[PDB]
Design a protein around this motif. Structure first.
Motif, mmCIF file in Angstrom:
data_model
loop_
_atom_site.group_PDB
_atom_site.id
_atom_site.type_symbol
_atom_site.label_atom_id
_atom_site.label_comp_id
_atom_site.label_asym_id
_atom_site.label_seq_id
_atom_site.Cartn_x
_atom_site.Cartn_y
_atom_site.Cartn_z
ATOM 1 N N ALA A 279 0.832 -1.202 0.000
ATOM 2 C CA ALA A 279 0.000 0.000 0.000
ATOM 3 C C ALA A 279 0.873 1.261 0.000
ATOM 4 N N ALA A 280 1.970 1.245 0.772
ATOM 5 C CA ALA A 280 2.928 2.352 0.855
ATOM 6 C C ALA A 280 3.659 2.539 -0.463
ATOM 7 N N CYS A 281 3.925 1.439 -1.188
ATOM 8 C CA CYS A 281 4.552 1.496 -2.514
ATOM 9 C C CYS A 281 3.660 2.314 -3.464
ATOM 10 N N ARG A 282 2.336 2.116 -3.383
ATOM 11 C CA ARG A 282 1.391 2.844 -4.227
ATOM 12 C C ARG A 282 1.305 4.312 -3.831
ATOM 13 N N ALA A 283 1.308 4.608 -2.510
ATOM 14 C CA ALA A 283 1.239 5.974 -1.981
ATOM 15 C C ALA A 283 2.475 6.777 -2.415
ATOM 16 N N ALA A 284 3.664 6.138 -2.391
ATOM 17 C CA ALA A 284 4.955 6.718 -2.775
ATOM 18 C C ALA A 284 5.168 6.740 -4.293
ATOM 19 N N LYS A 285 4.275 6.070 -5.043
ATOM 20 C CA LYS A 285 4.324 5.944 -6.504
ATOM 21 C C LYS A 285 5.653 5.335 -6.981
ATOM 22 N N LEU A 286 6.112 4.282 -6.272
ATOM 23 C CA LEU A 286 7.314 3.554 -6.646
ATOM 24 C C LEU A 286 6.915 2.741 -7.868
ATOM 25 N N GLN A 287 7.765 2.715 -8.873
ATOM 26 C CA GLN A 287 7.465 2.024 -10.123
ATOM 27 C C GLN A 287 8.045 0.632 -10.206
ATOM 28 N N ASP A 288 7.197 -0.318 -10.660
ATOM 29 C CA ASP A 288 7.518 -1.725 -10.916
ATOM 30 C C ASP A 288 8.204 -2.398 -9.701
ATOM 31 N N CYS A 289 7.503 -2.398 -8.566
ATOM 32 C CA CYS A 289 7.975 -2.961 -7.308
ATOM 33 C C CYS A 289 7.950 -4.433 -7.284
ATOM 34 N N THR A 290 8.999 -4.988 -6.690
ATOM 35 C CA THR A 290 9.165 -6.401 -6.406
ATOM 36 C C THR A 290 9.504 -6.395 -4.910
ATOM 37 N N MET A 291 8.714 -7.095 -4.116
ATOM 38 C CA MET A 291 8.945 -7.159 -2.674
ATOM 39 C C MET A 291 9.317 -8.554 -2.263
ATOM 40 N N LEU A 292 10.084 -8.655 -1.188
ATOM 41 C CA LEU A 292 10.465 -9.906 -0.555
ATOM 42 C C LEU A 292 10.265 -9.627 0.932
ATOM 43 N N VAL A 293 9.318 -10.356 1.537
ATOM 44 C CA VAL A 293 8.905 -10.200 2.936
ATOM 45 C C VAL A 293 9.113 -11.495 3.724
ATOM 46 N N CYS A 294 9.748 -11.365 4.905
ATOM 47 C CA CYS A 294 10.034 -12.412 5.899
ATOM 48 C C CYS A 294 9.714 -11.791 7.231
ATOM 49 N N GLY A 295 8.482 -11.974 7.700
ATOM 50 C CA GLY A 295 8.026 -11.349 8.937
ATOM 51 C C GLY A 295 8.046 -9.840 8.806
ATOM 52 N N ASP A 296 8.760 -9.186 9.696
ATOM 53 C CA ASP A 296 8.930 -7.735 9.656
ATOM 54 C C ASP A 296 10.095 -7.325 8.735
ATOM 55 N N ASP A 297 10.805 -8.306 8.113
ATOM 56 C CA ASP A 297 11.928 -7.987 7.227
ATOM 57 C C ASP A 297 11.404 -7.785 5.807
ATOM 58 N N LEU A 298 11.656 -6.609 5.240
ATOM 59 C CA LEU A 298 11.187 -6.253 3.914
ATOM 60 C C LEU A 298 12.291 -5.699 3.037
ATOM 61 N N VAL A 299 12.341 -6.172 1.791
ATOM 62 C CA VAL A 299 13.214 -5.665 0.727
ATOM 63 C C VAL A 299 12.328 -5.263 -0.440
ATOM 64 N N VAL A 300 12.612 -4.116 -1.054
ATOM 65 C CA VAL A 300 11.900 -3.640 -2.243
ATOM 66 C C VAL A 300 12.930 -3.402 -3.358
ATOM 67 N N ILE A 301 12.665 -3.941 -4.546
ATOM 68 C CA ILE A 301 13.460 -3.769 -5.752
ATOM 69 C C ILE A 301 12.499 -3.136 -6.759
ATOM 70 N N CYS A 302 12.842 -1.955 -7.257
ATOM 71 C CA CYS A 302 11.988 -1.246 -8.205
ATOM 72 C C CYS A 302 12.795 -0.550 -9.306
ATOM 73 N N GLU A 303 12.089 0.208 -10.182
ATOM 74 C CA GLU A 303 12.668 1.011 -11.255
ATOM 75 C C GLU A 303 13.047 2.370 -10.691
#
Ligand SMILES: O=C(O)/C=C/c1ccc(NC(=O)C2(NC(=O)c3ccc4c(C5CCCCC5)c5n(c4c3)CC(=O)Nc3ccccc3-5)CCCC2)cc1
Ligand SMILES: O=C(O)c1cccc(OCc2ccc(Cl)cc2)c1N1Cc2ccccc2C1=O
Length: 542
Positions: A279-303
């Motif tokens: 939801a935050a990715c959409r609010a921030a208008k990050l383009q072409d997001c790929t997320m990797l989530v492990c509990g509270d651990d988050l990685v985002v790879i985008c354009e």
């Protein structure tokens, strides 16, 4: 509401180990009121997640099946039976479990009691970047309730996250699959930018609404009626909150946030973090997001949208997470090299296999793994972090040269190569025979894990500096020691020779051409990289 309320009664007992003496310092940090404001992005993502949860058919586990998932040294019940009685399916254990199940079906409101305890974890004395970190607090219900959680939700927490989050669900990946996911995501972007997002005290930020939203996702599964009622009652009586009791049976206060020691902790945390982040990715208008989530651990790879635009999109992503009640510890920083991202304490590195072909693998700073392994050589511990580090970090320079050499020499001296040991992988406990390590490694990392070389100068220097700081003999000493360990293992034949040949091929003057281990295919790793179970009280014997 307040994440926690304290009576003032102490959280009593159960280079350095974390203890109940530092509990007061943790309590201060994790106690705060939460301010949560939802929006359209959040509601849209939720509906999308529920639409995917709707494809899941979950089964109710029988008492027997739930009992077999219980660790042999799982905390004793206050109702006159222990983990061994549960595993043996003793009359007293089974009758009590059934009375607990019946009570979940009949009582939909009374809060269930939990025990609060300070976790004893080992960290390395770093007097440069400050001082000692306070103990984490573990909150867990009685053994009877924990078996009921398994009956109602084991199949849910094991199947639902993947169905909801797809390729974003981190716990479905072996180390080899995780590095492949991150590399493919990075290579798929024209101009990639990635970042790790660290939530400050994630469990404390989890609101009662988040826990209800999380139940609304579970309720999308096809479920047995009693499973559906048990989930409704467990949500209301345990997951949303409840009273806290210390190890001496004194009232400590109350919790209105995530309990770290319940079956749904990992699944609930992953779904909540994913929801808020997507939801935050959409609010921030990050383009072409790929997320990797492990509990509270988050990685985002985008354009990347440009360096100033990226810094601006990250501040916007952070502002949205904060509104959703997930503010950051350290603020996120955009990275333009995949290797510079640290997620789940790990970074991607590159090496070469026996034919000069590029090989990606995950590594980390070896200080904490080495300190913990030193603690474990000094004294007996329930879980062996050294073994899990050998398993997860098998292709690394430090795990191969120091951890494999040291522990195999101890196992030879004690003649304990065949003795099964416990280790934790994604919160679940595994009883593993060290003689099975070559087969395990070939399956998780591939046959090249045994032939890696051309390690980067940064990785070599990080390992070398670490050894010097900790007073560990240099790499040359380890090569000399591994040759002797290897020779002794080869002379024994069978699985012991395979350990010698495969694990210590890096040590020999003339490297042997290694062929796939035939026994590796018949190894049952079906329950290994399916889901996360941190604090879930899960056991499996390989
Ligand atoms: O050529 C050169 O320039 C230097 C040569 C050189 C330097 C030191 C040695 N040390 C040894 O032989 C001894 N220790 C070790 O041969 C040793 C082995 C493992 C050690 C570990 C860990 C490594 C990971 C697995 C668990 C054991 C630690 N420390 C170790 C020391 C040093 C130590 O004492 N403690 C710690 C504390 C924190 C972290 C690591 C360590 C055994 C008897 C005398 C001390 C040997 C050769
Ligand atoms: O520590 C945890 O419980 C944990 C929580 C979330 C994600 C994780 O792995 C995610 C990942 C996968 C593969 C690799 Cl190479 C590194 C990180 C975790 N790891 C890390 C770990 C290293 C060594 C022994 C076990 C574990 C284990 O379970």
């Amino acid at each position: 509401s307040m994440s926690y309320t304290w009576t003032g009664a102490l959280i009593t007992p159960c280079v350095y180990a974390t203890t109940s003496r530092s509990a007061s310092l943790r309590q201060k940090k994790v106690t705060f009121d939460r301010l949560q404001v939802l929006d359209d992005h959040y509601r849209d993502v939720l509906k999308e997640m529920k639409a995917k949860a709707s494809t899941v058919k979950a089964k109710l586990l029988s008492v027997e099946e739930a009992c077999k998932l219980t660790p042999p040294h799982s905390a004793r019940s206050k109702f006159g039976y222990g983990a061994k009685d549960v595993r043996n399916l003793s009359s007293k254990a089974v009758n009590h479990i059934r009375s607990v199940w019946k009570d979940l079906l009949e009582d939909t409101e009374t809060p269930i009691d939990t025990t609060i305890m300070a976790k004893n974890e080992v960290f390395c004395v770093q007097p440069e970047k400050g001082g000692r970190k306070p103990a984490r607090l573990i909150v867990f219900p009685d053994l009877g309730v924990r078996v009921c959680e398994k009956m109602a939700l084991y199949d849910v927490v094991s199947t639902l996250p993947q169905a909801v989050m797809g390729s974003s669900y981190g716990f479905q990946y072996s180390p080899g699959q995780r590095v492949e996911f991150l590399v493919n995501a990075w290579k798929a972007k024209k101009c990639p930018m990635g970042f790790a997002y660290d939530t400050r005290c994630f469990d404390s930020t989890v609101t009662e609404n988040d826990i209800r939203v999380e139940e609304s996702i579970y309720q999308c599964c096809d479920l047995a009626p009693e499973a559906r009622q048990a989930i409704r009652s467990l949500t209301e009586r345990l997951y949303i909150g409840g009273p806290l009791t210390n190890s001496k049976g004194q009232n400590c206060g109350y919790r209105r946030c995530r309990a770290s020691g319940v079956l749904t902790t990992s699944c609930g945390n992953t779904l909540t973090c994913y929801l808020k982040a997507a939801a935050a990715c959409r609010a921030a208008k990050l383009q072409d997001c790929t997320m990797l989530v492990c509990g509270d651990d988050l990685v985002v790879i985008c354009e990347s949208a440009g360096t100033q635009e990226d810094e601006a999109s990250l501040r916007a992503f952070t502002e949205a997470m904060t509104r959703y009640s997930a503010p950051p510890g350290d603020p996120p920083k955009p990275e333009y090299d995949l290797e510079l991202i640290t997620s789940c304490s790990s970074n991607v590195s590159v090496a070469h296999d026996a034919s000069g072909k590029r090989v990606y693998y995950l590594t980390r700073d070896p200080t904490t793994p080495l300190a913990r392994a030193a603690w474990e050589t000094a004294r007996h511990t329930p879980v062996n972090s050294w073994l899990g580090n050998i398993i997860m970090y098998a292709p690394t320079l430090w795990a191969r040269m120091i951890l494999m050499t040291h522990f195999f020499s101890i196992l030879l001296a004690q003649e304990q190569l065949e003795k099964a040991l416990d280790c934790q992988i994604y919160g679940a406990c595994y009883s593993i025979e060290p003689l099975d390590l070559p087969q395990i490694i070939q399956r998780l990392h591939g046959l090249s894990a045994f032939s890696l070389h051309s390690y980067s100068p940064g990785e070599i220097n990080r390992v070398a500096s670490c050894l010097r700081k900790l007073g560990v003999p240099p790499l040359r000493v380890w090569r000399h020691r591994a040759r002797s360990v290897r020779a002794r293992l080869l002379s024994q034949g069978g699985r012991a020779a395979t350990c010698g040949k495969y694990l210590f091929n890096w040590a020999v003057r003339t490297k042997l051409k290694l062929t796939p281990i035939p026994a590796a295919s018949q190894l049952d790793l079906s329950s290994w990289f399916v889901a996360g179970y941190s604090g879930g009280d899960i056991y499996h014997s390989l």
